[PDB]
Ligand binder design. Structure first.
Ligand SMILES: Nc1ncnc2c1ncn2[C@@H]1O[C@H](COP(=O)(O)OP(=O)(O)OC[C@H]2O[C@H](O)[C@H](O)[C@@H]2O)[C@@H](O)[C@H]1O
Ligand SMILES: Nc1ncnc2c1ncn2[C@@H]1O[C@H](COP(=O)(O)O)[C@@H](OP(=O)(O)O)[C@H]1OP(=O)(O)O
Length: 179
């Protein structure tokens, strides 16, 4: 529903990108006070309550958020450094990243890089990978990433969302296919 969606979009923006511009100071792990997040959200959507934020967190289908005690964080997507959980994805054999075709000259030479984020974000889900690439351009390619290649190279893959995984970078040898 549009109420849930518009408050969640604002939560993700505050918690991933501009907490300080709403007066919040994330701790090392990226958590802000839940009460303080609620007041920040209410500067935009005055109907928001803590109970509604708790409902958004628990019902989020991607696993975007985490509440711990009286604090809340985004679980990935940040454009500032945070220490996240190191729940390691050891089971996935391939992972996916969608990107505009125009990026293949750089990506296939340099690998995937975190760009303005802290981590490279990949997915266990091809459609969601492609839909993320579509945010950046109409002509997108599906990158297929060999998870064992990454692990062997010392790049741990972490369970950030239900489908989202994070990794420090993806060297080009680990990009097996671009479709
Ligand atoms: N070496 C490179 N050269 C050029 N472009 C590159 C390179 N490596 C990666 N890119 C592209 O640089 C761009 C970086 O765009 P951004 O928005 O930061 O990353 P996202 O598109 O993965 O979205 C991650 C999402 O996953 C979670 O939901 C988060 O919350 C996000 O919503 C991509 O097109 C890369 O392919
Ligand atoms: N329902 C929801 N809750 C929270 N956040 C949401 C969201 N639906 C979308 N977002 C985020 O909005 C940005 C633009 O994405 P579009 O609207 O172009 O698809 C992007 O976040 P960012 O700028 O950090 O990359 C998305 O995050 P996500 O990939 O988790 O949906």
């Amino acid at each position: 529903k549009p109420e849930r969606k518009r408050v969640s979009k604002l939560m993700a923006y505050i918690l991933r990108h501009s907490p300080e511009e709403f007066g919040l100071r994330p701790d090392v792990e990226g958590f802000v006070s839940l009460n303080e997040l609620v007041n920040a959200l209410k500067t935009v959507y005055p109907e928001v309550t803590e109970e509604f934020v708790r409902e958004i967190v628990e019902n989020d289908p991607a696993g975007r958020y985490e509440i711990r005690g009286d604090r809340i964080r985004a679980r990935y997507g940040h454009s500032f450094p945070v220490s996240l959980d190191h729940e390691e994805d050891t089971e996935s054999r391939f992972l996916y990243h969608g990107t505009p075709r125009r990026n293949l000259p750089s990506i296939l030479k340099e690998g995937l890089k975190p760009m303005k984020r802290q981590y490279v974000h990949v997915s266990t889900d091809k459609i969601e990978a492609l839909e993320t690439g579509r945010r950046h351009g109409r002509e997108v390619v599906l990158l297929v990433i060999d998870a064992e290649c990454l692990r062997k190279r010392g790049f741990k893959i972490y369970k950030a969302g239900k489908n989202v995984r994070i990794v420090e970078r993806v060297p080009p040898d680990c990009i097996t296919l671009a479709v």
